Amino acid sequence: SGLVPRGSHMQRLIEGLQKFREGYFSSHRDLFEQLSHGQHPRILFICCSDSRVDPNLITQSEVGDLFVIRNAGNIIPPYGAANGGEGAAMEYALVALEINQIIVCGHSHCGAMKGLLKLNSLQEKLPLVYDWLKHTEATRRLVLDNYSHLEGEDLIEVAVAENILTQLKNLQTYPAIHSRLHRGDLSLHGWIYRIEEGEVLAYDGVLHDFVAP
Amino acid sequence: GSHMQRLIEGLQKFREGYFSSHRDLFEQLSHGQHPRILFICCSDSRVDPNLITQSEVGDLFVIRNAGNIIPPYGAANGGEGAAMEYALVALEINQIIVCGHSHCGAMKGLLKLNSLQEKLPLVYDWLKHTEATRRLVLDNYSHLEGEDLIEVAVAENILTQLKNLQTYPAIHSRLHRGDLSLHGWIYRIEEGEVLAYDGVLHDFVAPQSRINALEPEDEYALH
Amino acid sequence: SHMQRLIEGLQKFREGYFSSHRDLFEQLSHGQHPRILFICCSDSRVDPNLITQSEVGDLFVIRNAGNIIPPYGAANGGEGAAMEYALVALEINQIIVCGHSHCGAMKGLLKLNSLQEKLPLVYDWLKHTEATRRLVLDNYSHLEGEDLIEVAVAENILTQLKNLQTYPAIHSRLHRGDLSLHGWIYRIEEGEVLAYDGVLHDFVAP
Amino acid sequence: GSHMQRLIEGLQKFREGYFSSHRDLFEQLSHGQHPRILFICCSDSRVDPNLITQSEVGDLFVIRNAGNIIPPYGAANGGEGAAMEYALVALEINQIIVCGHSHCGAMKGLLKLNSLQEKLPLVYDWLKHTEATRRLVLDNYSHLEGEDLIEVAVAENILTQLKNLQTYPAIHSRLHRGDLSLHGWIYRIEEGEVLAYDGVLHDFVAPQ
Amino acid sequence: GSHMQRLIEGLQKFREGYFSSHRDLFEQLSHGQHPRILFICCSDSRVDPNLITQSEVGDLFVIRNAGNIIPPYGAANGGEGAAMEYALVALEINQIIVCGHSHCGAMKGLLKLNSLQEKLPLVYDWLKHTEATRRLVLDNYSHLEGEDLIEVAVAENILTQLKNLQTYPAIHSRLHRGDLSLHGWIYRIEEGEVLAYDGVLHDFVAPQSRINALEPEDEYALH
Amino acid sequence: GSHMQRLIEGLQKFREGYFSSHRDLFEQLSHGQHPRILFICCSDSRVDPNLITQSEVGDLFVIRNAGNIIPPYGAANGGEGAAMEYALVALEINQIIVCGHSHCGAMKGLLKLNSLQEKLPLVYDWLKHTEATRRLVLDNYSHLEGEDLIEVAVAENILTQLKNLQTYPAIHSRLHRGDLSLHGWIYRIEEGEVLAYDGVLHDFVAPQSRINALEPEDEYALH
Ligand SMILES: [Cl-]
Ligand SMILES: [Cl-]
Numbered sequence A: 001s002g003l004v005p006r007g008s009h010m011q012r013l014i015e016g017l018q019k020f021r022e023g024y025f026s027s028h029r030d031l032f033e034q035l036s037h038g039q040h041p042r043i044l045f046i047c048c049s050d051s052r053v054d055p056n057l058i059t060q061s062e063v064g065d066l067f068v069i070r071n072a073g074n075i076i077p078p079y080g081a082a083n084g085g086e087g088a089a090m091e092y093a094l095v096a097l098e099i100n101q102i103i104v105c106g107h108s109h110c111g112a113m114k115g116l117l118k119l120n121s122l123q124e125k126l127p128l129v130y131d132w133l134k135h136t137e138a139t140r141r142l143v144l145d146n147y148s149h150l151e152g153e154d155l156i157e158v159a160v161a162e163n164i165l166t167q168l169k170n171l172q173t174y175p176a177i178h179s180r181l182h183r184g185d186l187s188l189h190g191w192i193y194r195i196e197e198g199e200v201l202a203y204d205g206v207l208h209d210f211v212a213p
Numbered sequence B, E, F: 001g002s003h004m005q006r007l008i009e010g011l012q013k014f015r016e017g018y019f020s021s022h023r024d025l026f027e028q029l030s031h032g033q034h035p036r037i038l039f040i041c042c043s044d045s046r047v048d049p050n051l052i053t054q055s056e057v058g059d060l061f062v063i064r065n066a067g068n069i070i071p072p073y074g075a076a077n078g079g080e081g082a083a084m085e086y087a088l089v090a091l092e093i094n095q096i097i098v099c100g101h102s103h104c105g106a107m108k109g110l111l112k113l114n115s116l117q118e119k120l121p122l123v124y125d126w127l128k129h130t131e132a133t134r135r136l137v138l139d140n141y142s143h144l145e146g147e148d149l150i151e152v153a154v155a156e157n158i159l160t161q162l163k164n165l166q167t168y169p170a171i172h173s174r175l176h177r178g179d180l181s182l183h184g185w186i187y188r189i190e191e192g193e194v195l196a197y198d199g200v201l202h203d204f205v206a207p208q209s210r211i212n213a214l215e216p217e218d219e220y221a222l223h
Numbered sequence C: 001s002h003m004q005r006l007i008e009g010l011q012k013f014r015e016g017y018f019s020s021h022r023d024l025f026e027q028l029s030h031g032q033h034p035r036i037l038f039i040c041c042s043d044s045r046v047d048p049n050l051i052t053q054s055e056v057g058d059l060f061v062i063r064n065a066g067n068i069i070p071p072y073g074a075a076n077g078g079e080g081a082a083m084e085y086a087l088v089a090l091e092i093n094q095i096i097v098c099g100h101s102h103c104g105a106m107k108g109l110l111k112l113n114s115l116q117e118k119l120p121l122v123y124d125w126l127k128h129t130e131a132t133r134r135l136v137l138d139n140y141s142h143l144e145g146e147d148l149i150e151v152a153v154a155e156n157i158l159t160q161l162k163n164l165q166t167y168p169a170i171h172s173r174l175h176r177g178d179l180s181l182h183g184w185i186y187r188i189e190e191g192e193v194l195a196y197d198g199v200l201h202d203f204v205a206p
Numbered sequence D: 001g002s003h004m005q006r007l008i009e010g011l012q013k014f015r016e017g018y019f020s021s022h023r024d025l026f027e028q029l030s031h032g033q034h035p036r037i038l039f040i041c042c043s044d045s046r047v048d049p050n051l052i053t054q055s056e057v058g059d060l061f062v063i064r065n066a067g068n069i070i071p072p073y074g075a076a077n078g079g080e081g082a083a084m085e086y087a088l089v090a091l092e093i094n095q096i097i098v099c100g101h102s103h104c105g106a107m108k109g110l111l112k113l114n115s116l117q118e119k120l121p122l123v124y125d126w127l128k129h130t131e132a133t134r135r136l137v138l139d140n141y142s143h144l145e146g147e148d149l150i151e152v153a154v155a156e157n158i159l160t161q162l163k164n165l166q167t168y169p170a171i172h173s174r175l176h177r178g179d180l181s182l183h184g185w186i187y188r189i190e191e192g193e194v195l196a197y198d199g200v201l202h203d204f205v206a207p208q
């Protein structure tokens, strides 16, 4: 009986689907026919679930190019630490799809990172988030131990950057990655997407900093 | 690398193109995200949730893994449950879509599960969370083969994830209150359409705003 | 003392009930062929064979504190395995989740954080019914005392039915129409059972 | 449904019958349970702990699973450890009985363990908590087969659970204190008798 | 760096001295290890099992962790069970010694367990495998404090580990078969002495080849 | 007499010999340990870390398991991570050495992993934590066999554990600060020498105080 305020969102989404069907799909039938025969992505793109991040949009990629993992905080647990989807998706990308490029892309104003900086406060209302963030506890420990001089937005920014670097260390513990890095076949990349400025900063191992590509 | 070079050129095209003509949207979004849909879909590079729904940046909070699987509550400690909880509890999302798709690699693997152990051991382990799909399909659709069998696995996998979602505390509590809807979508890549599960009918039909994927006889709720 | 009573009781059984039911026990010795999987609480006030006046051999029984079945893959104790054996090996096609009034596990659930010190294993176990706790705290925040416990008993049963639906053997058999699930509340003081009815969305006298 | 209909008719029969004849007992029990025994037994439908011990409602706090197994402390996160902890710590029980039984399906499975993984994967994983039974039986009773081997597996499984119980904090502490006792029982269905493990004789013998 | 320079100088002394005088021993050992004792002891730098027993290389197969703890069977997936299994099954070792020691940091932590969660979260979780020791000590020695309390915890921890070892399949089976014995030793660092648990006596006494740590009353075995 | 009789006689020789000449040291050590090195090595009886480095009691805090394996952070709940955390956080150690050795039984097992399931199931499961070694060796050294293959597995196993160590919070934070160093050593039993990994060179060389195992291209740090 009466007002149920969630319904407009679904109507809108279905209208948007019809617009895709009538618009982009209708002008790209050959592309979708070709793709239906198989995916051949060349990039594994790991990024946050945050609704403000669209990997295809910011890279102006066409459908078929990016095999994408999305979770809160763009975290890849150390090998063997977790039995969710992250390790399996990465493995499929590298072993079945033969991808040779992995990007860990974090972003400004990340909610997972804000949470990480107030971790104990999450237990009560966000218990699964609290447990999940333990897979990036190395970030938290490094940030709390070494960056106390920072506050506010500067501190969140450092947490976003350090979290990406933690995931690169975590990735190095997976068998498929360790083997292929020996082979010399595979490259890892760390990116920060700055939402307000529409830009990406990439980690440069010589400068030990995230800088414009 | 040519592929990385293409992405960097793409970044510039975005900044000079779409970003430049949507600066106010991005400054607004810089203050916070307010999505109204949790969209769970496959990592498959052929699937773009924002594209297929013509969503604007800010609209869809997205989980992507191989096979668009959500383990039952307490079964796993990866990203899935946590991202869903963040969406529902922190972001107050009230619509969840489990979106599968045609020709899904994870589903092909599920139908040849034992063969995955050697080269795809993590995928083998992960697909344990959709074992109910495999059991149901092998038991009840034993006469299907080839493309038809993969199509059934894609569809049934979505239905399994909907059962798995209903074991999470945030979901269970909100369904009692009647404040949340669950949807199951199959994106057909070549055909350019989506099919949606109508849980009253117990079948997939074209999307419409008054269906959802819950099966009434399994509500198990008081008043 | 109470061990002695049990030992005397063994004698009473052998000379009484066993003596007058020799055909039954000789029959049972060839195999178990239960009809029902009965999931209930460890509470000493609950006796499923007694309240249903079942014959020995009819009920394959799982008993734990709170009559909880964790979601599939969440736990590696006895519950899932016993259910699987019941359905796959023994071909049982009826499952009853039976809760009961005044359940200690439910009292604990409503004071969960306080259990961590002296009952750490109970604290961890009750996490498998956290969906109950969250639902009850969110949606019955104005209920108190006995009333709140009674609601937690009822809602706990329904949570377990949801959890059962995640198991492969259950999911597959429900598809085929070869399995039925039931939720029961046993009211100790009144000697009655109320059964969940999915059309009424309520627990009703059968 | 005829099976369910028969249960319902049994409920009414309990109400008008045993319940009506024991109103006082149930009113009293409505105020709390005060069992003095923790009874761990198999889910097997042929086993009824209250029946075989001629116990009254309220006497036995009961754990039932396939094979009457208690995993070692920390090994599992299902119901067993928690129910035992509730019994000992909250209900102050000071007697624990592990009761196995003849013809146990879990034990038949244990003796063909690898064959179970395909159709009974959860049972395969669960029986690993009694792998010490399997190893012991394979290494030390190689000259038994068939029903004799199953019977020895039933007996040995009980002893393994006693060892497993001894790893739980509440049990370890209270055994040291001296205010807790453990017991191992085998219920022979076909004979209507229980044999209890005797540490002096190192065998299961009739109680008296 | 200076620590490393000094350590590498010590390595050079080993090479020049003991190695050069024992080349044949090391050649022989290179063909296979044949130890006859599994020695479980603490990681504490004050404990050296070969030194205190004046053993030769090749004699002791050694497990070292903080607190000399062996989790119950199935409780953990670290190295302890696997190392023990290799010792018993592959190397046919018939003697296990659990050796604790005075002033053990793990035991000090155990007695203040809750205080460890913040800064030593992994130690906190690990010590749960000896929670039976903590519970026993808090329940049965409640009037002890300070060093007396730590001393009791050291001793009781050894007895807990013996219970935990008895849940492992190889141990359970070989105790019954007759090819295994268990021992529980306390090394008192300040005095250079060891006491051994005599399971018949239920007390710690001088070590003796005739005694072992199993209590006859708790055998739980069929004969 | 028996192995146990020898050990017990050895206790008395220790007390009346070495303990006497180091009586002041042991009195000092009874007040607290202050090691400066965390030494991780195999349980193998042929390895004695204090002997091979001619270390004094109090110098080396030691972890020993089969194969000298450190699981990745969060992957395991046995003793390894806890012991390392105690060493770094409670004892402020600033040097970690992962020491493997020639002819390692864990490495022989790793190369015949499937065969271990039946009689060494716990070892099979434990070796999962060094699967990255097995994958690398099978993929990249597929043409080696016999002793040559075991030798490469011993070396690559050390490198895997160094990657695993770098996932732990205490290590990651201290590496940022620059007050911790990681080393990878191979102890060659017959030959009486140690080889150390120089992470700049990406190869094993004779030990020296100004190398360590860290690979500069994988520093992944902000400065
Ligand atoms: Cl996306
Ligand atoms: Cl549903």
Ligand SMILES: [Cl-]
Binding pocket: C047, C048, C061, D048, D049, D050, D062
């Ligand atoms: Cl019962």
Ligand SMILES: [Cl-]
Binding pocket: E048, E049, E050, E062, F048, F049, F050, F062
């Ligand atoms: Cl050592």
Ligand SMILES: [Cl-]
Binding pocket: F162, F163, F199, F213, F214, F215, F218
């Ligand atoms: Cl490195």
Ligand SMILES: [Zn+2]
Binding pocket: A048, A049, A050, A072, A073, A074, A107, A109, A110, A111, A112, A113
């Ligand atoms: Zn984010």
Ligand SMILES: [Zn+2]
Binding pocket: B042, B043, B044, B066, B067, B068, B101, B103, B104, B105, B106, B107
């Ligand atoms: Zn897919």
Ligand SMILES: [Zn+2]
Binding pocket: C041, C042, C043, C065, C066, C067, C100, C102, C103, C104, C105, C106
């Ligand atoms: Zn109850």
Ligand SMILES: [Zn+2]
Binding pocket: D042, D043, D044, D066, D067, D068, D101, D103, D104, D105, D106, D107
């Ligand atoms: Zn049974």
Ligand SMILES: [Zn+2]
Binding pocket: E042, E043, E044, E066, E067, E068, E101, E103, E104, E105, E106, E107
């Ligand atoms: Zn110690």
Ligand SMILES: [Zn+2]
Binding pocket: F042, F043, F044, F066, F067, F068, F101, F103, F104, F105, F106
């Ligand atoms: Zn070794």
